[PDB]
Design a protein around this ligand. Structure first.
Ligand SMILES: CCCCCCCCCCCCCCCC(=O)O
Lengths: 237, 57, 255, 104, 267, 237, 125, 57
């Protein structure tokens, strides 16, 4: 009879504990593993892949394939805004449904860089230049191409290589940010303007589209496992 | 026959573990398995694409 | 000194050559091979034609209009009635194979469009009714196009399949379908898309007639457009080539 | 699992109405079999390997087409009979049911 | 551990890391140091909590049922299936094939039901949980000879102690559990379509060993799954449409995402 | 007082656990073992033995020794079917009661080959040839000798060696099969036809019998211990 | 110590076993093999199933009466509609193959008869 | 004085055990005893029968 003493925390059930337990089927021979292609070892390999972003999620576009498309055209001006949205990868309506955004909805903290790739989907005769800009929080959304230039920007020239990559870096005071909408840990703003104007010849379409893909860099991380707010079960199916 | 391993600590300790069953499906989970290989999902092409060079030349 | 835009593929007595292309996607980094001796379970010896099956079969073309939602094909079901590939799978009980999907769509500089080519393993699809399940010959099509449909299919007492393009018939976001090996055809640059897929299953061999390993999907994210005068009929063509195919359990023909 | 649980059958009057309830017993399900046909209240009952002929209007009109094999369908006759028939097959581990709507 | 950011400077050259082709799958492997000037920053962040083991290995209720100690419903039964709930199912349906050992936990609680009997002085209740493999005899009633549990694994629990926990080895005739199956069980291709064809996990039975009193009492059992030693293959996109049934992937078409006001709106 | 803590799964009874317990009869001297012949160390030594198979379990034959016998005779034709039954070693009425079949009824999974031995029990003057065939699942039971030949077959010629062995191999997609009747893991069909015709001289009987024995090969295995569905106890005897 | 009267032949998934037999005749002393690289003329690569064709196919039986003259079969034409052998020859233009002919006729000691089994190349009729 | 043995794992780990009683009928069961010899039930003849040769010559 070895003398022992029970500490607080006995005979309790923890949703997240790591103990051994007696097997109910002793001396069971499992099937020998075969090599199935494409093994996942971490969730940050599912997040580093591109996913089309629904930027035009306005009105009834969400019930159509039109949501993904960004409409660009030829106008008698310059410096007009194409699109803009905030940098909230888990919470913004724009990113909530993408692979990386859905992965973030299972975590509380996120920290890293963000890649944004744009592919031009117009004619092979149409040409133009765009200004892709990222503005850090402190002063509101830039309302002009001139205010946007003062922030991190990339001038994209459409040619043989249709795609372009704007890499939003980690500028934060803290080490991590909040996936949920918060005001202390604010993200920034991402806007797109016309660096020049869309140039189209005759007998070609002057109304084109762009597509946007979002992924993570090699320095992305997440923490605090939680429950996604998206799924809802009325009753046992 | 006990196994001594490292604890999960912050950056900028050892712990002991013994197996009490003979089933290999009774042990604790494998939480410290930090191995990644995203070259399957990302960059799944045949001809290697260098970053600096153009994609289609 | 050559151009990476030019590629040639030779299989069996067939060849394909491209003037403009992007690259070749090789599945999950795996090139398809044969079954090893430490992974097999069936005892009797496999047959391996090696040339009469592993060649290029060209399915029926489909017109890409200005309002086409998209198309889908079951790779095992599609080559069921084509050449000796169909005959071998008919007589045998167990079949193991890999494929490649070369999709060709050629347009002029003035034409503008975008197509997504993705292979989905275990692409189980849902029915319009919530209580019943999709009927065969409604989900499956022999050498047939099997297009999708913008807007939901009506709910009633009918084994019709839900064909919504935005949910893709699986209930998942159409945009996130880039997780599987995918290639994009951009009329302004890419003309064709090549994808190589290794055999993927939870078992070493499976009955080809009752199970489909993968589903090829072609979805126009950006519509087709042109000006009055240019050619309106713009077709898409698909060629599939079984790779490292082997069969077991020979018996009377049928299914 | 009974195939096509939600189904609607349109049959002309003076023609025997054919109602099909084919099912696939689960490997997990290993219990006594009971097949019950409801008219929305019973027309026929199969229980303990015995068939019982319940409804005065459909008396002498409702009979099985085949049960042990896996087919539990009925063939009604002398339609006048508009209603919903629910085929409920019972196994001790699991249960399934199919509802068929008949017009005229 | 994550990669550390390096330091670059001003550059004027023919190199084009940003410009690329998304026609190819090739996800651009660019880093911020290619499109701006960066400082050297050591990164001690570690990719540890994101591994599939830490993601899936947490207990999760999958089914809760009731039984009584008098009347008609005297025992409970449930075919083993993780698709009864939504939270565990959605997480498992990130992958096509999974292979994991299972840790099972039960939570059994009783409640005295309204009645009019008098002098009710109950005793401690003991409950028996029994598993039937695909093919084993199933109990017709609450006093059937099946409960002898000569070979079926069973467990007895006396109300008041720590819950009962047991560990189950990977049980499958295949080489991996299949979350999604595209096909039929019958060759003629006319029958059950879907994963239902593959599933064969047996049935679970729970009951009161003793009555314990003269008044009615209703017990409830909740089952908790924990995947251990997890392996996973071929990832797939998360479920957008809400679940409808447990046997199939039947859904109702829904919006790709939520809507805002304009395309330039920040909220 | 060593500080300890109780984990979930304490004070429970498991029908299948492996613990030590204090002996109720301390220092007890057991009888010295003697060598009794024929020791069993595994149940797969009881299964590798031949057992007569009741193929003719039709009508009231089950209440007679007639069930075991397979009747063969002389007919003015050829290619006629002798017998046929499915390959379900644990579930088929034909094998449910044999040694191997009864052993399988205590297990959920089975995986290996199956030996089928046939002994000719006619006159020493009667001669003939038989075609024993096994067809993998996918297309239904063969209805002709010609459809049966396309599957695994053995042509048996009756002579000095009366017995013959058809060895049904393991052709399956999975690693294991289900002992219970299942449609995913189907077995196949085993049929027997007349390769030629039974030849009998005068003053000899033209109506003979065959007998069938079933056993397992050296690669048979079973898993998931369960309860046989055959025994039933009304009350404590 | 065995008896030369007993023989077994295994091809593909098929077997034949004899209790009484004479011997095996091996053609013109040549065992059938594949086409060499110095004897071939076609350039494109051949297919060789190796198991799905090279097995035993059993043709319809024939009654031997007291007044039967005899029977004849064309070996290429006979296996035209049987198994995968027929399907492969249908799709292809050129086919090269060898065969074996096991003829079975069993009777009792009291029965008396004689049968001649011969293969005739280019048996133009 | 503890005994270290191997756990039952799949193909294609060690555990520790100590005896706390002095009775030898208190220990756990012997589950890992994989020894077979079917030459008693099968092939129970006097003169060895080779497979390829005939049974009765
Ligand atoms: C009293 C003993 C109880 C023992 C019960 C054991 C039941 C095991 C059930 C395992 C279900 C696993 C299902 C996984 C399905 C999937 O991953 O797709």
């Amino acid at each position: 009879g070895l003398p022992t003493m029970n500490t607080p925390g006995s005979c309790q059930f923890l949703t997240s504990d790591d103990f051994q337990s007696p097997s109910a089927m002793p001396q069971y021979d499992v099937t020998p593993e075969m090599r199935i292609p494409g093994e996942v070892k971490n969730l940050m390999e599912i997040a580093e892949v591109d996913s089309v972003v629904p930027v035009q999620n306005v009105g009834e576009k969400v019930n159509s394939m039109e949501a993904y498309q960004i409409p660009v055209r030829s106008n008698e001006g310059s410096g007009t805004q194409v699109f803009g949205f905030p940098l909230q990868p888990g919470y913004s309506s724009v990113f909530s449904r993408t692979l990386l955004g859905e992965i973030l909805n299972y975590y509380t903290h996120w920290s890293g860089s963000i890649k944004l790739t744009f592919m031009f989907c117009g004619s092979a005769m149409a040409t133009g230049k765009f200004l892709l800009a990222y503005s850090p929080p402190g002063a509101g959304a830039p309302t002009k191409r001139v205010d946007a230039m003062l922030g991190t920007h990339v001038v994209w020239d459409v040619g043989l290589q249709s795609s372009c990559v704007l890499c939003i870096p980690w500028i934060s005071q803290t080490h991590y940010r909040y996936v949920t909408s918060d005001e202390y840990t604010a993200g920034g703003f991402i806007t797109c303007w016309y660096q020049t104007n869309i140039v189209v010849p005759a007998d070609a379409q002057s109304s084109c589209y762009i597509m946007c893909f979002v992924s993570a860099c090699n320095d992305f991380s997440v923490r605090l496992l939680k429950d996604t707010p998206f799924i809802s079960q009325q009753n046992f199916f | 026959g006990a196994q001594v391993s490292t604890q999960k600590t912050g950056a900028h300790i050892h712990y002991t573990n013994i197996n009490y069953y003979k089933d290999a499906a009774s042990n604790s989970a494998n939480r410290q398995d930090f191995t990644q290989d995203p070259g399957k999902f990302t960059e799944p092409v045949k001809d290697i694409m260098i970053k600096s060079l153009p994609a289609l030349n | 000194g050559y151009s990476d835009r030019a590629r040639s593929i030779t299989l069996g007595n067939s060849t394909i050559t491209t003037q403009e292309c992007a690259n070749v996607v090789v599945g999950y980094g795996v090139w398809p091979d044969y079954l090893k001796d430490s992974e097999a379970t069936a005892e009797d010896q496999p047959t391996q034609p090696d040339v009469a099956t592993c060649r290029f079969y060209t399915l029926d073309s489909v017109q890409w209009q200005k309002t086409s939602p998209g198309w889908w094909w079951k790779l095992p079901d599609a080559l069921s009635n084509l050449g000796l590939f169909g005959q071998n799978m008919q007589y045998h009980y167990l079949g193991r194979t890999g494929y490649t999907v070369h999709v060709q769509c050629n347009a002029s500089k003035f034409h503008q469009g975008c197509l997504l080519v993705v292979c989905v393993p275990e692409a189980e699809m849902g029915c319009a009714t919530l209580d019943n399940t999709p009927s065969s010959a409604e989900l499956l099509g022999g050498d047939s196009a099997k297009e999708f449909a913008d807007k939901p299919v009506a709910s009633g007492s009918n084994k019709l399949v839900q064909r919504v393009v935005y949910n893709a018939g699986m209930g998942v976001g159409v945009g996130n379908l880039t997780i599987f090996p995918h290639q994009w055809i951009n009329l302004r640059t890419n003309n064709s898309a090549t994808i190589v897929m290794p055999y993927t299953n939870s078992v070493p061999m499976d009955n080809m007639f009752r199970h489909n390993n993968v589903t090829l999907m072609v979805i126009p994210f950006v519509p087709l457009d042109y000006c009055p005068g240019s050619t309106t009929y713009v077709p898409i063509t698909v060629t599939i080539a079984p790779m490292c195919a082997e069969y077991n359990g020979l018996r009377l023909a049928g299914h | 699992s009974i195939t096509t649980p939600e189904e609607m059958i349109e049959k002309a009057k003076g023609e025997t109405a054919y109602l099909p309830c084919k099912f696939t017993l689960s490997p997990e399900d290993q219990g006594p079999l009971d097949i019950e046909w409801l008219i929305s209240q019973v027309i026929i009952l199969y229980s303990g390997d015995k068939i019982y002929d319940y409804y005065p209007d459909l008396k002498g009109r409702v009979h099985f087409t085949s049960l042990k094999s896996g087919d539990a369908s009925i063939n009604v006759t002398n339609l006048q009979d508009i209603g919903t028939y629910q085929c409920k097959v019972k196994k001790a581990p699991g249960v399934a049911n199919k509802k068929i709507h008949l017009v005229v | 551990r994550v990669a550390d950011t390096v330091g670059t400077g001003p550059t004027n050259s023919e190199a084009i890391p940003a410009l690329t082709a998304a026609e190819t799958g090739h996800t651009s492997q660019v880093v911020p140091g290619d499109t701006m000037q960066t400082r050297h920053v050591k990164n001690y962040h570690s990719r540890s909590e994101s591994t599939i083991e830490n993601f899936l290995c947490r207990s999760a209720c999958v089914y809760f049922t009731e039984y009584e100690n008098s009347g008609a419903k005297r025992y409970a039964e449930w075919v083993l299936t993780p698709r009864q709930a939504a939270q565990l199912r959605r997480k498992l349906e990130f992958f096509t094939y999974v292979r994991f050992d299972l840790e099972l936990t039960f939570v059994i609680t009783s409640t005295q039901q309204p009645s009019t009997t008098q002098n009710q002085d109950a005793q401690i209740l003991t409950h028996q949980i029994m598993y039937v493999p695909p093919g084993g005899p199933v109990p017709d009633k609450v006093d059937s000879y099946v409960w002898q549990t000569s070979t079926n694994p069973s467990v007895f629990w006396t109300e008041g102690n720590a819950p009962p926990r047991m560990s189950i080895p990977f049980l499958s005739i295949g080489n991996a559990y299949s979350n999604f199956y595209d096909g039929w069980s019958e060759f003629s291709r006319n029958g059950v379509y879907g994963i239902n064809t593959l599933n064969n996990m047996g049935t679970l039975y729970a009951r009161h060993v003793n009555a314990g009193s003269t008044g009615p009492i209703k017990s409830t059992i909740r089952i908790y799954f924990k995947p251990k030693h997890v392996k996973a293959w071929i990832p797939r996109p998360p479920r957008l449409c809400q679940y409808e049934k447990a046997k199939n992937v039947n859904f109702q078409p829904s919006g790709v995402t939520t809507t805002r006001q304009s395309i330039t709106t920040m909220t």
